[PDB]
Amino acid sequence: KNPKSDKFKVKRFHHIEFWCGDATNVARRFSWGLGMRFSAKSDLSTGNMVHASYLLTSGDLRFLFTAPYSPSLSAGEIKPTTTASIPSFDHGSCRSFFSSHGLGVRAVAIEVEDAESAFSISVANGAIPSSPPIVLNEAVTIAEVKLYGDVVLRYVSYKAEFLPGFERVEDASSFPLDYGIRRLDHAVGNVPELGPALTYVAGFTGFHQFSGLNSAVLASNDEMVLLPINEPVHGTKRKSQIQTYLEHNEGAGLQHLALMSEDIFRTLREMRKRSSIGGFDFMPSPPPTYYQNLKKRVGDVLSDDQIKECEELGILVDRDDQGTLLQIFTKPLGDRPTIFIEIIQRVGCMMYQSGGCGGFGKGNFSELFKSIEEYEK
Amino acid sequence: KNPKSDKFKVKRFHHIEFWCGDATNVARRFSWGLGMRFSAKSDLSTGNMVHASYLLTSGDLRFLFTAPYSPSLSAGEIKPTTTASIPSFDHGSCRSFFSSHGLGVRAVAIEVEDAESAFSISVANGAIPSSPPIVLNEAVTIAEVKLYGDVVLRYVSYKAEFLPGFERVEDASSFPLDYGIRRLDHAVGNVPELGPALTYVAGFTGFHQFSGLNSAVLASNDEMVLLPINEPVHGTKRKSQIQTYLEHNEGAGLQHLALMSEDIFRTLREMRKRSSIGGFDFMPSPPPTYYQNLKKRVGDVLSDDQIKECEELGILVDRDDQGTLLQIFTKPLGDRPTIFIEIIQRVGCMMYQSGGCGGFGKGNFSELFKSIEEYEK
Ligand SMILES: Cc1c(Cl)ccc(C(=O)C2=C(O)C(=O)N(C3CC3)[C@@H]2C)c1Cl
Ligand SMILES: Cc1c(Cl)ccc(C(=O)C2=C(O)C(=O)N(C3CC3)[C@@H]2C)c1Cl
Ligand SMILES: [Co+2]
Ligand SMILES: [Co+2]
């Protein structure tokens, strides 16, 4: 059931912004690890005396990496005279965020029809304002409300190239890496209490509802903006990974980003080639029994060769009543056991493909448990 | 003239420690960019609840990358019960350093015969103590004094593998990258006033003395520990890069690290291959006239082919009365126009090769000026 109750017109995920201590080194690591091209910058070389911001792109996926300069470079400026390209940026907020949480997502940005209306309607419906709507070069409007923890939901709307004040990067610096990643599929938050988090976010957006944790997914009208939220389940034998996250992150925050690949086998071949030379590591592969048991579960979707390819790369597979899900998880992206990345490809639900086709892989919890147990053998 | 006036026995450069906001992403970027292997770690997986520290090595060169965890993970500990592997580490000092200076070198570490004696003698001769000598697992002694700005000179001595509490890394994670870099040749500081900086450092070590700036080099007895220091020259047409450094760094600090290569042509081929895919960029190449003029200056040292190889890679060449110097500079390593890296190879002064053979390239200032002028043509 989809009531289509969005309180304002939402289009697609637009970008994800990481707050960093040094944007250069994080961006370069991510570019090589994920096969994303450098495509825009806003920094000293573009007149920005406030923050260094570098944009990576792969297909429609946009990762922004931002770090503060010394406040002294901009101590003469005031907000009317600011050289910052992202007016919501604040030196103190950024340093407080990174010292508290370490490297992580500050903003989940969605493109909307009218960012000022989205902000006003959100706040009228309980959203905690973070940064009021600001019109950038009479062309782009940006506004921010609190989502969970110190993560904001960022609204962006365009009258008619990332943001004003960002320059496209020189093609010499812009090497066309591409491992097949094409768009953000979902962005997941960890909170202490799921109920109040859902009530808050669904309250101001109108988004509808789509071991160790309880979870639920909020979705926009066409279910292309997908925001799962997790809470820990206390008192289990194995301590909840959600609780470990909250402890190491100093509270609620973004847990994982799911990136859709147009060819998950190629993406994982390419990423795994680079794991030990600057890229990303992957969680331990499931035991061979998991792949033995995949014939009975998805034998009608993937051939024996395609499932063998999954076993090589450590891919996981799940299936709902509508489609099939291929997925795999990186180790944490930084020092702390907090944020990680999921690579995903979905099969089925063709009308274009409908959002969330195949679910989010919750069947893989019991199947992995069963798998290791019967693997022990 | 070399008075050999060291006030304590100094061996070689031991390691350079960067203070980071996220050690993982910086270390992985540096590993790929410079061809250095991951060889030791101290972090949550080794029982360290205080800081994440990752060691990269290439030949004898050791780069350490350290970032703080949430203080809450170790809030129950006291210094006697600390899980930190580097006892001088302090959460507050580290966060203050990175917010003030951004990514940069916290410690220039030299190996000495007796770190406690070096500390005591240094402090008796004017050194400002930073961290008193601590004996680690009855095996290694570590102590720190202020060098300049918030950079410390770190003494390490071994009774008889990096530091106790560091684990060698699993060979799967340890990919044997190597672009030919073999050791640290010199480490350079920028200060506001050269005179008082020299008087201070030469005062407590006994080290002897070996446009836009004035500079001087302090050296140990065998001139294998080499510490150049720069000050800005004010009032020139083109603003001093030393002054720009001081402004963007919020004061004195480490300007560049010079890394000796056993084959600078191979190192630069390998690094330049990776510039646009996660590695390091290099400063703009000198004009062809510079390479035209190299026949008259070093035609007896490098063949026409070897000088052509220099022109391809943008290498610079200088020469004193004792040897020849091949050098090239990266763009800044991080967001701010502060720290960069020099790659170097020295030819001549064979006895082993004596330290500083060929100087530090100060002849390249006037030669580059002349070169661009006569290039304009
Ligand atoms: C480690 C692991 C496995 Cl074994 C399987 C799926 C995912 C995953 O991506 C999740 C989401 O996107 C979501 O909404 N989830 C809820 C349970 C519905 C899961 C947590 C993860 Cl992290
Ligand atoms: C941009 C540039 C050029 Cl054009 C040539 C050499 C170096 C260099 O490495 C320096 C040192 O190591 C040192 O002691 N130096 C003093 C002058 C004696 C220079 C600055 C640099 Cl940065
Ligand atoms: Co997911
Ligand atoms: Co130098």
Swiss-Prot record, chains A, B:
Residue ranges occupied by any VOC domain in the UniProt entry: 12-158, 183-331
Domain of life: Eukaryota
Group of enzyme by EC: oxidoreductase
Residues the entry annotates as binding Fe cation: H186, H256, E342
Gene3D superfamilies in UniProt: 2,3-Dihydroxybiphenyl 1,2-Dioxygenase, domain 1
GO molecular function, one term: iron ion binding
Pathway as given in its UniProt record: Amino-acid degradation; L-phenylalanine degradation; acetoacetate and fumarate from L-phenylalanine: step 3/6; Cofactor biosynthesis; prenylquinone biosynthesis
Keywords: Cytoplasm, Dioxygenase, Iron, Metal-binding, Oxidoreductase, Phenylalanine catabolism, Repeat, Tyrosine catabolism
Oligomer and partners: Homodimer.
Role: Catalyzes the conversion of 4-hydroxyphenylpyruvic acid to homogentisic acid, one of the steps in tyrosine catabolism.
NCBIfam families, per the entry: 4HPPD (TIGR01263)
Protein name: 4-hydroxyphenylpyruvate dioxygenase
Lineage start: Eukaryota, Viridiplantae, Streptophyta, Embryophyta, Tracheophyta
Gene for this chain: HPD
